[PDB]
Amino acid sequence: PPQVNSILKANEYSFKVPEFDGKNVSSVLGFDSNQLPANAPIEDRRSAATCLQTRGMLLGVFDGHAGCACSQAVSERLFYYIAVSLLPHETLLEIENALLPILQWHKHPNDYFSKEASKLYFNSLRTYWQELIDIDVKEALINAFKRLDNDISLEAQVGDPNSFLNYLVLRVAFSGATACVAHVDGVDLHVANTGDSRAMLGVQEEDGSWSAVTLSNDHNAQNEREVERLKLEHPKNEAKSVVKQDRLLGLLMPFRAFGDVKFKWSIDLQKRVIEKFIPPNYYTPPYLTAEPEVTYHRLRPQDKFLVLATDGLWETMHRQDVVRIVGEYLTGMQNAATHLIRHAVKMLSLPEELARMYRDDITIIVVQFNSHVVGAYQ
Ligand SMILES: [Mn+2]
Ligand SMILES: [Mn+2]
């Protein structure tokens, strides 16, 4: 390069699930992830963690808008809500007393946790697990998303003594974030999706060709069921106004998300909290949820990898090109997501604050499955 590899690869991570007793024993071999920014501070986020008290692995991509406070928040909190929602009763009790390790994060050095907000965050989680004390995975993911998005709403209202923290809850509730998350326990894949990010299964066909299977539907204006669902959630007189110019109330591209309290709160609460300023065409809120659509897939020996990615990838390529490219990469004919980012974008359309003229933030996780272990459950 004149230095192109240095950039593509600046953020590229990749994790191997450790061998036990000399053998690859998991249905997951490992994953690769990378990000390429188009925005100042990048607005996408990526996360990956292993449940320590329950078996599964969590992976996630989050596409922030109107700042990165909310993608940052959910990129670090959501997995704890999901994890704690999977804990059996007896285990919850343990923790309330004590302390037991919950998640092992697989993060690149550029990913980070919020130092200053840690106490507050633990407190809401704790509050949450206390109430759970007083197990369907699908129904866990759902309540976890909802509960996170709701706590985000409460924390914005409650504010904080610390002027900086008080500011943070607000910046978090007023910016928004998509969320597309995989949970894998053995042969059981669940994909919880909220927004226009996307999980895609790469299937190798018996002739060795590559096929793409969708595990999520983009929650936007192309999505019929979604436009139908928005209308049904409001009086008939709104059917014309709910979605316009392909946007939620003429504004938001993604039709589901965290934060974005502007599209959820009553006008009077937006006013009282105003201590941003503008509401939409806005009669019967809330208009927007963080509640995810959840898909289950039982893994097969054909099922070779899962690509989770924000729309910066997807707007660029056909689903089939993504799965083919990764398909060929993994199979001989480095990091799969660096590769996809390279095709997505010899050619130096990169430099400067004119990038988001030509591209979005791109964040990609490629999980690779262990066909022998998966096939061993067949
Ligand atoms: Mn974004
Ligand atoms: Mn995007």
Side-chain angles (χ1 to χ4, degrees), residues 39 44 63-64 196-197 310-313 315 360-362:
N39 282 122
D44 281 7
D63 176 350
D196 51 13
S197 287
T310 57
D311 53 359
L313 180 50
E315 305 278 60
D360 196 356
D361 302 335
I362 296 165

Side-chain angles (χ1 to χ4, degrees), residues 301-313:
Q302 318 100 271
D303 298 329
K304 303 298 184 179
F305 57 85
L306 183 60
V307 173
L308 309 214
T310 57
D311 53 359
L313 180 50

Side-chain angles (χ1 to χ4, degrees), residues 123-134 136-221 223-235 237-275 278-287:
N123 289 342
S124 325
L125 187 64
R126 190 185 173 172
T127 305
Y128 178 50
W129 76 52
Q130 283 156 346
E131 300 182 25
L132 279 174
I133 279 154
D134 291 24
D136 180 335
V137 170
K138 179 154 176 297
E139 223 36 50
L141 297 156
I142 292 162
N143 309 319
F145 278 52
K146 292 173 64 178
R147 152 74 59 140
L148 178 63
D149 188 56
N150 187 267
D151 286 4
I152 280 177
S153 181
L154 296 180
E155 299 145 17
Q157 298 172 242
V158 173
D160 199 71
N162 187 287
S163 90
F164 172 83
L165 257 171
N166 180 249
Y167 204 31
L168 182 150
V169 295
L170 266 8
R171 272 157 52 227
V172 171
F174 281 11
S175 58
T178 239
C180 178
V181 159
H183 176 277
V184 198
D185 179 21
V187 83
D188 304 300
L189 221 200
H190 288 262
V191 175
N193 188 66
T194 289
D196 51 13
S197 287
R198 192 196 298 166
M200 200 101 300
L201 198 67
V203 179
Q204 213 187 188
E205 228 63 73
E206 55 189 51
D207 73 332
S209 80
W210 291 105
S211 147
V213 7
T214 264
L215 296 180
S216 81
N217 315 294
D218 299 356
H219 304 319
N220 54 206
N223 182 334
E224 300 207 321
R225 273 183 53 222
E226 202 74 336
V227 170
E228 161 168 291
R229 182 195 112 262
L230 266 329
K231 300 191 218 254
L232 289 171
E233 264 172 28
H234 309 268
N237 55 69
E238 286 184 52
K240 49 208 86 146
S241 44
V242 179
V243 166
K244 61 184 222 47
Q245 314 301 301
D246 290 344
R247 270 147 146 94
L248 199 257
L249 295 179
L251 297 157
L252 243 187
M253 290 288 276
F255 291 175
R256 301 203 200 188
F258 290 88
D260 278 331
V261 125
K262 174 216 245 37
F263 295 83
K264 295 159 160 160
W265 288 358
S266 74
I267 295 177
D268 171 78
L269 185 62
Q270 295 182 46
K271 303 208 160 136
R272 303 198 323 286
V273 171
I274 307 304
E275 295 332 306
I278 255 343
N281 171 199
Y282 201 70
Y283 312 134
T284 35
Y287 281 83

